[PDB]
Design a binder for this molecule. Sequence first.
Ligand code: VOA
Ligand code: VOA
Ligand code: VOA
Ligand code: VOA
Ligand code: IMP
Ligand code: IMP
Ligand code: IMP
Ligand code: IMP
Lengths: 326, 326, 326, 326
Amino acid sequence: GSWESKFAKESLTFDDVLLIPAQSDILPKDVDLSVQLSDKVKLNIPVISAGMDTVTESKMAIAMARQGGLGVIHKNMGVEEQADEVQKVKRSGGLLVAAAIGISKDTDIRAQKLVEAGVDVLVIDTAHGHSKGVIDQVKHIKKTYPEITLVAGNVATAEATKDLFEAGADIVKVGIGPGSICTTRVVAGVGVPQITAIYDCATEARKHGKAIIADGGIKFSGDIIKALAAGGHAVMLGSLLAGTEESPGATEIFQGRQYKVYRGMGSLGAMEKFVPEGIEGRTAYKGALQDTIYQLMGGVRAGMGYTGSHDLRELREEAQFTRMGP
Amino acid sequence: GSWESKFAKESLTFDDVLLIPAQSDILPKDVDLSVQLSDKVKLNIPVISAGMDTVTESKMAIAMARQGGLGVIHKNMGVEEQADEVQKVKRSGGLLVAAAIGISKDTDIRAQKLVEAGVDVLVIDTAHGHSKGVIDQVKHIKKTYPEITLVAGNVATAEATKDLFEAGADIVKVGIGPGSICTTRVVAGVGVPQITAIYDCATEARKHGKAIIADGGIKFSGDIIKALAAGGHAVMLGSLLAGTEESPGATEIFQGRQYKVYRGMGSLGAMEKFVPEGIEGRTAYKGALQDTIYQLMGGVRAGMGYTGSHDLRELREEAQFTRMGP
Amino acid sequence: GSWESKFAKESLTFDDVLLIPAQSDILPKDVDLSVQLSDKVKLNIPVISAGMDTVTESKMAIAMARQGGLGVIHKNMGVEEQADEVQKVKRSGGLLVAAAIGISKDTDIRAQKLVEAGVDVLVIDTAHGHSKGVIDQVKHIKKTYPEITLVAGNVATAEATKDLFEAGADIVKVGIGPGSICTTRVVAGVGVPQITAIYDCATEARKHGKAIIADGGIKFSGDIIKALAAGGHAVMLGSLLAGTEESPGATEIFQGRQYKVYRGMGSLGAMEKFVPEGIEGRTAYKGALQDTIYQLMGGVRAGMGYTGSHDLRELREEAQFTRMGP
Amino acid sequence: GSWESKFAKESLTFDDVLLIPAQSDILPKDVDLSVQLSDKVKLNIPVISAGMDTVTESKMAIAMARQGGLGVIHKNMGVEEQADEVQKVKRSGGLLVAAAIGISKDTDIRAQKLVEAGVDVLVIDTAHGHSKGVIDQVKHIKKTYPEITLVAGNVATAEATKDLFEAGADIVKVGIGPGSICTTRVVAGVGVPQITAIYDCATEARKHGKAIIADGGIKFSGDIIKALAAGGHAVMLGSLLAGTEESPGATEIFQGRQYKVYRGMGSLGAMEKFVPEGIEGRTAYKGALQDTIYQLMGGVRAGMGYTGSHDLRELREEAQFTRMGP
Ligand SMILES: C[C@H](Nc1ccc2ncc3c(c2c1)CCOC3)C(=O)Nc1ccc(Cl)nc1
Ligand SMILES: C[C@H](Nc1ccc2ncc3c(c2c1)CCOC3)C(=O)Nc1ccc(Cl)nc1
Ligand SMILES: C[C@H](Nc1ccc2ncc3c(c2c1)CCOC3)C(=O)Nc1ccc(Cl)nc1
Ligand SMILES: C[C@H](Nc1ccc2ncc3c(c2c1)CCOC3)C(=O)Nc1ccc(Cl)nc1
Ligand SMILES: O=c1[nH]cnc2c1ncn2[C@@H]1O[C@H](COP(=O)(O)O)[C@@H](O)[C@H]1O
Ligand SMILES: O=c1[nH]cnc2c1ncn2[C@@H]1O[C@H](COP(=O)(O)O)[C@@H](O)[C@H]1O
Ligand SMILES: O=c1[nH]cnc2c1ncn2[C@@H]1O[C@H](COP(=O)(O)O)[C@@H](O)[C@H]1O
Ligand SMILES: O=c1[nH]cnc2c1ncn2[C@@H]1O[C@H](COP(=O)(O)O)[C@@H](O)[C@H]1O
């Protein structure tokens, strides 16, 4: 019964687990960081910059794509402005570009202009992916544009992952409540500790032979490899990339120290009705994206050498974790 | 044996659990927040202001009732003064009003005057509801006034909930030691982590077809929905409402910042013999109650949309939680 | 095998548990706080002041005994001086008095002089009670003085409790590493979380029909009732009593605030070779012992009313706990 | 399946466990602290100073050996300079000396010069011992120099311990991520909580009849005895010894207080490509090594008396632990 099972489930977060070292014949410099997200999308590094207004526009998307990654242009701008940002990326050496779409009335014209601008991947980006409004949008976007790779989310269960893959999504984005700037857990009382969310969703994805994006809660390079080893094909970063020069924000000074503004897409300012589910704050200026990425991938490479993971397929399928206390 | 089972039980609090997101066809704006506490009592929002001297008098009770909620007038005043506070609420558009009663000698005349003043619900409010003094009072008040909805508490077990429902209570109030200002755990060594207390008591309540009030420990809107999803029909708030203008306290200033006094009904000052089980302190001035309630219900609505809970019956009966570590 | 079972055991401390409230017909004022520690020793309150140099001498022992408790005169003084301290207590209205004895050469003459001074209970007080030196001393002291109540400790297992009771002890004192000023856990890597230590030792004591003293780690009145409900007949306090006027220390002033010195009997200063296992520090001046005791017993009474424990026998045998997280 | 077992393993650290006190006929002064690491290597105390540049050179190695211990001369210097440091130790009364070797090209000439200088034990010191590069080096060094005691590591599993012992190692060094200055867990996402790592590796070592070194994470004397009781034959210290006069660092002054530099062998400065896995910081000046060791062994002796461990064989094989919460 539903009553009896209320408190049955146990979930894990990044800080609850560590990768166990294993037999390795491969050096960190020699590991393969590439991942196939779909038939058309192949990334050299498993990192995607977040579809947020304090994180990704053309400057971030170009820089990300030049590192072998990908950037999701945020939808908190006009249809034309978004298509123009997509154009800048494509005109920068035919770089892979992703763009965010919602469920609202404006989606129909937005998706056409983005596809027209030469977008590679469309991202149905919502707070609650396990909904009718989102399922219908997935069916619609996939019927209208079958050549464009479709990402749909956010979800945190196997049932939600099943339903999105069945509706027509190519990639499912996982994460409900783990984000650094997220207040959903405290406001709505809802969330799935991210390691369990990734694992439960990837368990389902493995059946469909499809990819998942581990979105939110990544604090360091160690969280990146843990997110991939739990089942994620690629990770999505907000906090770790917001402080870089390439993020759309303006560099500010406060008591000598250089800072950049980072906020939730559900914060008061970003929403400009729904009660806020995100915060707005300050994050230290990081410098060039390229240097942030190099440090992050260095740590991921170190971990793949420790686990004897020659590639990401060997990490996702074979790497073992140990649970531990605080 | 009693000896062998000493440490058998495991209990959970709000911070130990989160609601798992589920299939949803309903938007937060569209969810139904109403709850039937008894045949005569129907609330538009599942919130009740606490029967405390730094929380509820006529000003709080009117404001609460105008939001679709309910206020429990505290019993730390004279019989006539209490009846007059009840009168003010009833004379304010026939608003639903609740009033607190004890077990002491003065209860007999107090209950008559409150009923005379047009009270809708009587609350036998004690520290230890699983007692002979309380069982007898429930039988007495229900025989004398069968038309008035009777709330009895506080309890934290199924056995206590059974005994109150059998004695004649319509609603059982759950909470032993979780209150923000409570020191019972540290003083008396007694308590039941509130999520388990609600669930164990609601498991019993479901058999009798009766309602339970989740009383104490609520820090944010996320704790409200967790308390309801664990089995509570409505929640009781102290701390979250004490800082509002409508609370009986006087607005004070200390080093520029505006504060309001909030104290336990078992603190030294409130008791004015029993050793203190509550603290007296300062809480930031919140402003209008109406705005505090709107933010709180906004978060509860967000959570009901995440879980696909069209109403509170679907939340209490079907919503699933995950346990997690610190 | 010993190898396979290395990490089998799980242990609990005070902060891991709470008493579950139960059916109660008794009020806190009406509960019985008396306990029979032996055929000759009957205490009105289950509290014993610690056999420490910053805690108990004649002034503490008299004050303790006048509250219905007991004081253990420390052995960090001359034989004659100790006997004189015992005399002062006996000459103060025939008050019950306890005195500490070791295992060293001086024990033989010390025990005779203390018995001569009219001591009621002798305490073989050691860091490691589960030893040959201690077993032999128990046999010796019990053969030589069969009319004097013998306490032996400290221990933290059933096997140790069995061996002391079999050697001739009347009461076994439980506690290895829980003391507020103790550093044994960090220095020696040894300890048994105190709730489990009490329960495991009391499980053994129940077979012999004998009493146990829950010694160390008590921070508040809630820890007192938890220690008794876990199986302890009486508790021993260091930290909670050291700040009182009756403790042998001198009242000092530091930056306006009044303090008293409290130290481990295994600290550098107290030892005046063994590496230190205790710390020396400052504790706030508490005032009169009588007031400290009244507050503490008030909390214990509150808890006995919550659990429906009319007496300590009903607490120790029937009271149930719940485990919980941080 | 590998997928299903991803989160099966549970691991423990020092802070998760305590030694249970047991029947003891031995006093701390009387316990035997000696350990046989190999046929040729016998230590009077189970302590080895770390093969680090802010910890061990000739001055540390001589002082360690004079306490009955051992020092591993670090390999972050020239071949001749290392052999000269080894010479100074041997010329200081034929004291036991250990020296670090890697897997790199320079290893072949380095190992010859160290053996020529009269080294007793060679240490193949790596970040990831469960590798082909390390297995091959073990086979090579053991074939070329069968008279010199070979230590190989670092590892954290039974499989890794098996493979090193089979390749020709005499002693396996255990520790992946527990070091005070280590950032591997946060950078690479890899680690095995040290108590479990020691126990899992020693379970394997017991089959081969060989010794293991518990390396890293030791904060106090309590962690030393816990590391040995979990299966370690001897411990390796970095942090605890870095502040002593005998460490190669220079004594510095900062705001009155005396400090010494302590850094990871994977920190930026020490590496002078791999991303850093260690930090560089300041540690308080401790004084003479001899005094640090005396305090540490005093605590280990206290613990062996509590557990009735007459020797280290009785500790490793019979001592029992209890798990506990935070
Ligand atoms: C106001 C709030 N705004 C956002 C915006 C962007 C987000 N982006 C990612 C994530 C979340 C986000 C929340 C929350 C869950 O974690 C991932 C939001 O839309 N609330 C909401 C609540 C319930 C339902 Cl049914 N629909 C929507
Ligand atoms: C002094 C103390 N005062 C209060 C007052 C209001 C309360 N209101 C709610 C709650 C508690 C309260 C305690 C404590 C448990 O959590 C809920 C109280 O009456 N102690 C008490 C102890 C044992 C028994 Cl048999 N009877 C009464
Ligand atoms: C130096 C240290 N001094 C004390 C003094 C008083 C104590 N009083 C109570 C307790 C402890 C105490 C330790 C430690 C355990 O918790 C209770 C002590 O004697 N160490 C010790 C170690 C091993 C063995 Cl075989 N024998 C003795
Ligand atoms: C840069 C990093 N430097 C060090 C240096 C000394 C160490 N010494 C002891 C330990 C560790 C150490 C790491 C890390 C694990 O804990 C014990 C290192 O070499 N990374 C590394 C990563 C993966 C692989 Cl396949 N190979 C090497
Ligand atoms: O306001 C918000 N509430 C909750 N989650 C958010 C909000 N805005 C963005 N997110 C999520 O948080 C992620 C970033 O997480 P981070 O990398 O930990 O900062 C984004 O990629 C979104 O999925
Ligand atoms: O002094 C007291 N001791 C213990 N609980 C108290 C005391 N006074 C009130 N309470 C409870 O605490 C609740 C308020 O909890 P809060 O909303 O967390 O502040 C009240 O509704 C009472 O049930
Ligand atoms: O130096 C010491 N090391 C360890 N335990 C000690 C020491 N001195 C006294 N104790 C114990 O600590 C108890 C006091 O604990 P407290 O009430 O938590 O301060 C005493 O009654 C002794 O059993
Ligand atoms: O940079 C590094 N990263 C990780 N571990 C390190 C590093 N340098 C040394 N170690 C390990 O840390 C141990 C010292 O640990 P400690 O005694 O806790 O400071 C050394 O003996 C090495 O095994």
